[PDB]
Design an enzyme around this catalytic site. Structure first.
Site, PDB file in Angstrom:
ATOM      1  N   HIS A 136       0.807  -1.212   0.000  1.00  0.00           N
ATOM      2  CA  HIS A 136       0.000   0.000   0.000  1.00  0.00           C
ATOM      3  C   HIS A 136       0.846   1.270   0.000  1.00  0.00           C
ATOM      4  O   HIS A 136       0.277   2.360  -0.080  1.00  0.00           O
ATOM      5  CB  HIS A 136      -1.031  -0.005   1.153  1.00  0.00           C
ATOM      6  CG  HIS A 136      -0.458   0.055   2.541  1.00  0.00           C
ATOM      7  ND1 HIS A 136       0.193   1.165   3.037  1.00  0.00           N
ATOM      8  CD2 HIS A 136      -0.500  -0.839   3.559  1.00  0.00           C
ATOM      9  CE1 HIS A 136       0.557   0.941   4.289  1.00  0.00           C
ATOM     10  NE2 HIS A 136       0.144  -0.265   4.633  1.00  0.00           N
ATOM     11  N   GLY A 178       3.266   5.914  10.439  1.00  0.00           N
ATOM     12  CA  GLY A 178       4.650   5.774  10.021  1.00  0.00           C
ATOM     13  C   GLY A 178       5.271   4.422  10.335  1.00  0.00           C
ATOM     14  O   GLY A 178       6.393   4.141   9.872  1.00  0.00           O
ATOM     15  N   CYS A 197       4.213   1.356   9.471  1.00  0.00           N
ATOM     16  CA  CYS A 197       4.050   0.274   8.508  1.00  0.00           C
ATOM     17  C   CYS A 197       5.399  -0.146   7.937  1.00  0.00           C
ATOM     18  O   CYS A 197       6.280   0.684   7.674  1.00  0.00           O
ATOM     19  CB  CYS A 197       3.100   0.697   7.385  1.00  0.00           C
ATOM     20  SG  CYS A 197       1.414   0.935   7.957  1.00  0.00           S
TER      21      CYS A 197
HETATM   22  C1  LIG Z   1      -8.829  -1.380   8.757  1.00  0.00           C
HETATM   23  C2  LIG Z   1      -8.761   0.146   8.842  1.00  0.00           C
HETATM   24  C3  LIG Z   1      -7.365   0.607   8.434  1.00  0.00           C
HETATM   25  O1  LIG Z   1      -7.226   0.316   7.079  1.00  0.00           O
HETATM   26  C4  LIG Z   1      -5.973   0.539   6.525  1.00  0.00           C
HETATM   27  C5  LIG Z   1      -5.719  -0.017   5.265  1.00  0.00           C
HETATM   28  C6  LIG Z   1      -4.478   0.192   4.678  1.00  0.00           C
HETATM   29 CL1  LIG Z   1      -4.174  -0.498   3.073  1.00  0.00          CL
HETATM   30  C7  LIG Z   1      -3.472   0.927   5.325  1.00  0.00           C
HETATM   31  C8  LIG Z   1      -3.719   1.468   6.597  1.00  0.00           C
HETATM   32  C9  LIG Z   1      -2.620   2.277   7.257  1.00  0.00           C
HETATM   33  C10 LIG Z   1      -1.859   3.153   6.467  1.00  0.00           C
HETATM   34  C11 LIG Z   1      -0.796   3.928   7.049  1.00  0.00           C
HETATM   35  C12 LIG Z   1       0.013   4.913   6.211  1.00  0.00           C
HETATM   36  C13 LIG Z   1      -0.694   5.651   5.246  1.00  0.00           C
HETATM   37  C14 LIG Z   1      -0.026   6.600   4.457  1.00  0.00           C
HETATM   38  C15 LIG Z   1       1.347   6.816   4.629  1.00  0.00           C
HETATM   39  C16 LIG Z   1       2.057   6.089   5.597  1.00  0.00           C
HETATM   40  C17 LIG Z   1       1.393   5.145   6.391  1.00  0.00           C
HETATM   41  C18 LIG Z   1       2.211   4.383   7.428  1.00  0.00           C
HETATM   42  N1  LIG Z   1       2.826   3.824   8.196  1.00  0.00           N
HETATM   43  C19 LIG Z   1      -0.567   3.822   8.452  1.00  0.00           C
HETATM   44  N2  LIG Z   1      -1.370   2.917   9.223  1.00  0.00           N
HETATM   45  C20 LIG Z   1      -1.119   2.775  10.637  1.00  0.00           C
HETATM   46  C21 LIG Z   1      -1.393   3.828  11.510  1.00  0.00           C
HETATM   47  C22 LIG Z   1      -1.136   3.656  12.870  1.00  0.00           C
HETATM   48  C23 LIG Z   1      -0.613   2.441  13.354  1.00  0.00           C
HETATM   49  N3  LIG Z   1      -0.342   1.385  12.460  1.00  0.00           N
HETATM   50  C24 LIG Z   1      -0.602   1.566  11.104  1.00  0.00           C
HETATM   51  C25 LIG Z   1      -2.373   2.162   8.631  1.00  0.00           C
HETATM   52  O2  LIG Z   1      -3.139   1.310   9.422  1.00  0.00           O
HETATM   53  C26 LIG Z   1      -4.983   1.280   7.197  1.00  0.00           C
END
Ligand SMILES: CCCOc1cc(Cl)cc(-c2cc(-c3ccccc3C#N)cn(-c3cccnc3)c2=O)c1
Ligand SMILES: CCCOc1cc(Cl)cc(-c2cc(-c3ccccc3C#N)cn(-c3cccnc3)c2=O)c1
Lengths: 306, 305
Positions: B41, B143, B145
């Site tokens: 992603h 940040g 991920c």
């Molecule tokens: C089920 C509901 C959430 O559905 C999603 C689906 C997808 Cl594809 C991604 C994310 C997600 C993206 C992002 C993300 C985005 C843009 C740039 C950078 C990042 C990063 N780093 C971060 N974090 C996140 C936040 C806090 C703790 N851990 C993870 C996501 O859950 C969330």
């Protein structure tokens, strides 16, 4: 979201761990620049333990009575000196893995990461706090002496603990990296016992603020307290006195949550009176006191889940 | 003596973390040999993530659209491809700090260490377990991920988790390093929920053994039970079933303590039915289930890496 006992990444410290042998006694040392630091009781024998005369034991040693091993490489000791309860072995090679570092003697209530090591090799990493009675509740087996505690705020390692002894109650005692013991303990096997321990109040309040930041408010109430009345009550549950310094240190978390410190103190008073009534706080059924205010700001979002 | 939730030393993995930037998005990647691994992603804008066609999105990107930073050093991307939900970025130089490693997929109940990273820079380490509902109760901010989970089995780092998402309840979901999700989740920005979680029975038993090794033994009793009767109790209190394989896995702890597994099972049964008094076990008022039997052995025996 989430909240765990989070240690610092240990690699900067792993690269400093060595094995030190004197006689039949082997334990861990810390190799920084061209010096290896270790507990001075490496020079004791099985009979030496009740009342060792370290000055008399050390003058009988030459540089080559000390065997220092870094991985599969033997380091050559070219000098030695005793500083308080730590032995400093000068070696002929500087550690090329030496991180930016400093030595800091911490206050009771401060936390740090421990890299537990055996024979100069790391076993595991975990968080600890310096208890009010100057022990730490570690996880250490025989051979762990010389393992160190540290923080790595910014990119600088602050070494604050070196492990020397396990006490009869199963808790642990040691020194700063200048060899000065935390607490009243001495490095000999005479009867000694830590004082009665207490709960680190400022840390419990910090962890309650963490719970609010992460979205949980069930334990708050409509009441407040004076600082004096809070300490009067908290003392009856074996909690440490909360000082104005502690109230100031909690300021940032108070500002982020909108909960005045003395209002969180009233919540804590009620929790001590009521228990949790089947509920949990950040996954715990007991009040947690080994996260500092600084630890909470380190780990939690700067944006409260309102 | 003492018993702590204990992570593996993280140094071998720290040398593998890099920063990956695509467009406005930055997250973490894992650099092993000449390939950087990160969540697919990374190629999505926020609107993309609402309903992504990843193969179509990836077509519109070249190697120079991926900015990879190892510390202060820029890594040159020379190829790119997807494997399931993981992007694989081929770079022109193999990581000289690559440890002996393999990719493993773990089972619910297994524990691992998480190296939480931001902008390619490791910030903390902690211990997690794969929950029965295939989430992990991690600690992650935006940040994070691309942060990874791992075990160290002798000399070899076994990578088992890459972080992708935070669910609305605050728990976390991710993939193995071949990009297969743990659990019934998809990498799309949409409402997703994990099923009701249960307690990892074999792990609670391992921790009761850890308590006896550390001298905390008030819960031992005269009674024994059968696997069949115990599983009836586990089901009632939303504990996972205990299999004969679990009994055998607990063998070494049963040998160290001398206490048969079905003996301990009668202790756990009475704890489930009556609770504790105002009593604790290894300092806890809850029955801990994120220590595996091997976790207990390695901590109490001082195994090094
Ligand atoms: C089920 C509901 C959430 O559905 C999603 C689906 C997808 Cl594809 C991604 C994310 C997600 C993206 C992002 C993300 C985005 C843009 C740039 C950078 C990042 C990063 N780093 C971060 N974090 C996140 C936040 C806090 C703790 N851990 C993870 C996501 O859950 C969330
Ligand atoms: C006050 C009661 C204990 O008083 C002392 C005094 C002194 Cl000088 C040392 C020790 C001590 C020594 C040793 C030791 C000995 C020989 C060879 C190697 C070592 C080592 N490694 C180990 N461990 C220990 C054991 C388990 C957990 N953690 C620490 C000690 O507490 C204990």
């Amino acid at each position: 979201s989430g909240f765990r006992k989070m240690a610092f990444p240990s690699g900067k410290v792993e690269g400093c761990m060595v094995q030190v042998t004197c006689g039949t006694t082997t334990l861990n040392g810390l190799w920084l620049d061209d010096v290896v630091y270790c507990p001075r009781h490496v020079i004791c024998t099985s009979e030496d333990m009740l009342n060792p005369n370290y000055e008399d034991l050390l003058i009988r040693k030459s540089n080559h009575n000390f065997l220092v091993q870094a991985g599969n490489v033997q380091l050559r000791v070219i000098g030695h000196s005793m500083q308080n309860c730590v032995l400093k072995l000068k070696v002929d090679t500087a550690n090329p893995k030496t991180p930016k570092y400093k030595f800091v003697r911490i206050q009771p209530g401060q936390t740090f990461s421990v890299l537990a090591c055996y024979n100069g090799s790391p076993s595991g990493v975990y968080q600890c706090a310096m208890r009010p009675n100057f022990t730490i509740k570690g996880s250490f087996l025989n051979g762990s002496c010389g393992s160190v505690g540290f923080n790595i705020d910014y990119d600088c390692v602050s070494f604050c603990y070196m492990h020397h002894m396990e006490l009869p109650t199963g808790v642990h005692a040691g020194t700063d990296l200048e060899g000065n013991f935390y607490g009243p303990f001495v490095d000999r096997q005479t009867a000694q016992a830590a004082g009665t321990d207490t709960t680190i109040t400022v840390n419990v309040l910090a962890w309650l603020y963490a719970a609010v930041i992460n979205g949980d408010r069930w334990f708050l109430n409509r009441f407040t307290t004076t600082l004096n009345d809070f300490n009067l009550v908290a003392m009856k549950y074996n909690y440490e006195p909360l000082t104005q310094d502690h109230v100031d240190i909690l300021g940032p978390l108070s500002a982020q949550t909108g909960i005045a410190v003395l209002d969180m103190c009233a919540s804590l008073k009620e929790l001590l009176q009521n228990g949790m009534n089947g509920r949990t706080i950040l996954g715990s059924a007991l009040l947690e006191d080994e996260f500092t205010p600084f630890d909470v700001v380190r780990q939690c979002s700067g944006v409260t889940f309102q």
